[PDB]
């Protein structure tokens, strides 16, 4: 049950075959209330954290960003764009974890089945 | 125990005999106060998730919804008309749950026990 | 230890001796905030549920409903006159519950010590005993 | 660790000897700020619950009540004067509880050790 | 660990060789939000409880009270100008009473194993 | 899991060999929103709580504080123009003590263990890096 994430520019510490230097996500969350909530995710403190801090503190948009979930072979593809790192929130104690909120224009949701059933949408412009 | 629900259009991931391709449901909840509440429920991120995205994000209306409970033979059925996905919240950590809302108009409340006992109502049109 | 509620028309499922087809309550609370709180209680999903939904939806008057507590042997009895169903809050999970609130105007508390009875009553609409 | 509460007219159920027909308390509390808080306490549902409901329903002043903490032997006293029944919340679920609030105009504290340390106060009208 | 407290006026029940007749303090917390919260400590209901009532009821000024934590005496806390505001006895079948006091100065003296570090401030006088 | 914090003038009590008179930090956090949270860390009540007391109440400008994490020197943060907001001892029968810090600028320094180091910082009070 592994989660991964890719950002243009940013480069993670991940080390699997089909994709190296991804970000290793621990938990991902977001909602659709029509309005969209920011994407919230948590990871270790790792090599992206400086980049993350930076992207955030720079407001630099992000051409793409891709979330993936696979059970211990993947099956779930979350595809966000035009992305602005809202907040980075380090924290630690004697772990060190790191939550982030991001602000995206659109998202495509891919769900691969033993085929697929896809779904996306633009929020800055209400088109399927 | 065994909770299953149908949405016209939305198929689920059911492998069951008296209904396959139905949404396996984990929790459900709805209040009345007389303004009825959005119905909430929480399934695995499964094959309905992308369409639940859509019906939500389309704000499209649904012909019929039917909720079924039974034990570990179906005892409890809930039936609903003009359905509008109010909210959809997918999330995951290393469950992957998705907590959904639904605005509706009528509800039918059957229950196999005399045989059955049923009471309905329409909350837009105030009638039976 | 054992609670049974009895409402007019609306019928529980229970197969007791000293009651029958009565509502099997799993929890109740009520308060006197002189203001009176509504009563709430939570039973399984049982034959009374559409009735309560009906009576909640209709808002139709009920003459009375009666709650009784009992060991595990009666011992505690509440009587309430005049009743309107306010909130029904069913739910379920692969743990089927059903909250019910409801508004009344009078309460009679009947306590039967293990010897006599101690009773107290009131009317809230018309301040009276 | 026994707690017994004596209030005229309202009878508890205490099997004890140095005070029978006494409200077996299970929990209590009160502040001073300098408008005192109420007094909250909690007993099983008992013969006192009818006497405490009516007395709440009527709201009839109660002259004097006495509060006792003992050890598993009487060591702690409180004396409250001018007392009104404000709230009563019997819960039940297959403890069998009923919490109370009351309002005093004057409270006494008394505490035995090798001496006994005593103090009271009137609050409706401020004086010692 | 141990925590003892000695108040001008109020006699305790702790038996320590260096300082019997102090308050055996259970907990305590305080800040400088410059704005100072109250001291807020905790103790079993003991001989000090009536006098604290008296002071809390009578609002009488307390020149000084002194705070000690030692292991199972690194911390010495000094406060002056003290008044009793909250007092909250509460029982059940722990017999507790929390208190909050208002202090104009504090002197925080930390011993080291060595000597002491020393820290004091007049919030009212904004000096030291 | 070893977290140390070097503050200038506020001496420490930390018995480690790459650095002594260091603070033993228990837990820390902070949040960007641009707009930054204060710094937040916890420690026991130790030699620094008097030093940290004054720096708070007297509000003296801290040049710099340096925070490090390392496993049972891989993460560094540098904060400058610092002032102690609030001090908070407590304890009972752990003596805990949390403190909060307000920096003008922060650096962030992650050495990667085997090839490189990724770094990031910023001046907020003059919206610059």
Q: What is the per-residue DSSP string for C36-69?
A: -PPEEEEE-S-THHHHHHHHHHH---EEEEEEEE
**Rounded to whole angstroms, how far apart are CA atoms B86 and F68?**
46
Q: How many CB atoms lie within 10 A of CB A23?
A: 27
Nearest by CB to C45, which of B27, B76, B119? B76
For chain C, the residues before each gap (C–N > 2.5 Å) are 33, 72, 94, 114
Residues in contact with F58: Cβ distance below 8 Å, sequence separation at least 6, in sequence order? E121
**Rounded to whole angstroms, how far apart are CA atoms F55 and F11?**
12
User: Quick check: D52 and D12 in contact, CB under 8 A?
Assistant: no
Which of D117, D122, D125, D127 to mutate against chain E (most E CBs within 10 Å)?
D117
User: Quick check: F38 and F101 in contact, CB under 8 A?
Assistant: yes
Residues in contact with C46: Cβ distance below 8 Å, sequence separation at least 6, in sequence order? C12, C13, C23, C24
**Rounded to whole angstroms, how far apart are CA atoms F84 and A51?**
28
Element (H, E) at A57: helix A48-58
**Rounded to whole angstroms, how far apart are CA atoms D72 and D1?**
5
**Rounded to whole angstroms, how far apart are CA atoms B39 and B105?**
11
Compute the residue count for chain A: 128
Scored b (16 or more CB within 10 A) or e, B100-109 reads bbbbbbbbbb
Q: Residue A15 — φ and ψ, nearest 5°?
A: -150, 60
**Rounded to whole angstroms, how far apart are CA atoms B37 and E43?**
48
Contact B31 C89 (CB under 8 A): yes
The three-state secondary structure class of F33 is coil
Nearest of C54, A109, D56 to residue B57 by alpha carbon: A109
D50 is written with which tokens? 């009818």
E19 is written with which tokens? 């300082």
C2 is written with which tokens? 């054992």
* Closest residue in F to A102 (Cα–Cα): F33
For chain D, say whether C28 makes contact (Cβ under 8 Å): yes
Nearest by CB to C94, which of B3, B113, B118? B3
**Rounded to whole angstroms, how far apart are CA atoms E24 and E26?**
7
B89 is written with which tokens? 């919240």
- Counting Cα atoms < 13 Å in the Cβ hemisphere of E77 gives 24
**Rounded to whole angstroms, how far apart are CA atoms E3 and D122?**
34
With respect to CATH, is domain B1-128 assigned 2.30.110.20? Answer: yes
SS3 content of chain F, % helix, strand, coil (to 5): 10, 55, 35
Q: Residue A83 — φ and ψ, nearest 5°?
A: -100, 135
Q: Residue A82 — φ and ψ, nearest 5°?
A: 45, 50
For chain F, say whether E94 makes contact (Cβ under 8 Å): no
**Rounded to whole angstroms, how far apart are CA atoms E77 and E106?**
7
* DSSP 8-class letter at A54: H
Q: How many CB atoms lie within 10 A of CB E127?
A: 9
Nearest by CB to A28, which of B57, B88, B91? B91
With respect to CATH, is domain F1-129 assigned 2.30.110.20? Answer: yes
Query: How far apart are the CA of F17 and the nearest CA of chain A, in angstroms?
Result: 18
User: Quick check: C30 and D89 in contact, CB under 8 A?
Assistant: yes
The three-state secondary structure class of D49 is helix
Chains A and E lie in contact, requiring 3 or more CB pairs less than 8 Å apart: no
| Distance from the first to the final alpha carbon of chain E | 29
- CA distances to B19, F55, F62, F108 from F80, in Å: 65, 14, 7, 12
Burial of B63 (0-12, 13-18, 19+ CB in 10 A): exposed
Nearest of B22, B6, B16, B45 to residue A117 by alpha carbon: B45
Contact C1 D94 (CB under 8 A): yes
**Rounded to whole angstroms, how far apart are CA atoms D128 and E3?**
32
Query: What resolution in Å is listed for this PDB structure?
Result: 3.0
B24 is written with which tokens? 């396996």
The three-state secondary structure class of E20 is strand
**Rounded to whole angstroms, how far apart are CA atoms E16 and D3?**
30
Q: Domain extents for chain E?
A: 1-128
Nearest of A31, F104, A62, E56 to residue D128 by alpha carbon: E56
Q: Which residues in B17-115 belong to E strands, given as ranges?
A: 23-29, 40-44, 62-70, 74-93, 97-103, 106-111
* DSSP 8-class letter at E17: T
* Closest residue in B to A36 (Cα–Cα): B57
Q: Which residue has the tokens 């006192």?
A: D48
D10 is written with which tokens? 């309202």
Q: What residues form DSSP beta bridges with A44?
A: A97
User: Quick check: D10 and C81 in contact, CB under 8 A?
Assistant: no
Q: Which residues in chain D belong to E strands, given as ranges?
A: 2-7, 23-24, 27-29, 39-44, 62-70, 74-92, 97-112, 116-122
**Rounded to whole angstroms, how far apart are CA atoms C77 and A44?**
58
B97 is written with which tokens? 């749950």
Nearest of E125, E116, E43 to residue E81 by alpha carbon: E125
Q: How many CB atoms lie within 10 A of CB E119?
A: 23
Degrees to nearest 5, angle at CA E36 with E32 and E38: 120
The three-state secondary structure class of B107 is strand
- Taking a contact as any Cβ pair under 8 Å apart, which residues of chain C between 50 and 69 contact chain D? 69
Burial of C126 (0-12, 13-18, 19+ CB in 10 A): exposed
Scored b (16 or more CB within 10 A) or e, D94-104 reads eebbbbbbbbb
Chains D and C lie in contact, requiring 3 or more CB pairs less than 8 Å apart: yes
Element (H, E) at E48: helix E48-58
């Amino acid at each position: 049950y592994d989660i991964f994430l890719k950002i243009d520019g940013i480069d993670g510490e991940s080390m699997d075959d089909k994709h190296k230097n991804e970000i290793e996500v621990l938990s991902w969350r977001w909602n659709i209330h029509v309005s969209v909530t920011n994407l919230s995710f948590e990871h270790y403190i790792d090599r992206a954290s400086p980049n993350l801090f930076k992207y955030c503190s720079s407001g630099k948009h992000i051409p793409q960003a891709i979330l993936v979930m696979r059970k211990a072979l993947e099956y779930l593809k979350y595809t966000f764009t035009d992305l602005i790192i809202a907040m980075v929130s380090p924290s630690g104690s004697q772990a060190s974890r790191e939550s982030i909120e991001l602000s995206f224009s659109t998202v495509k949701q891919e769900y691969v089945v033993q085929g697929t059933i896809t779904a996306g949408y633009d929020f800055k412009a209400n088109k399927e």
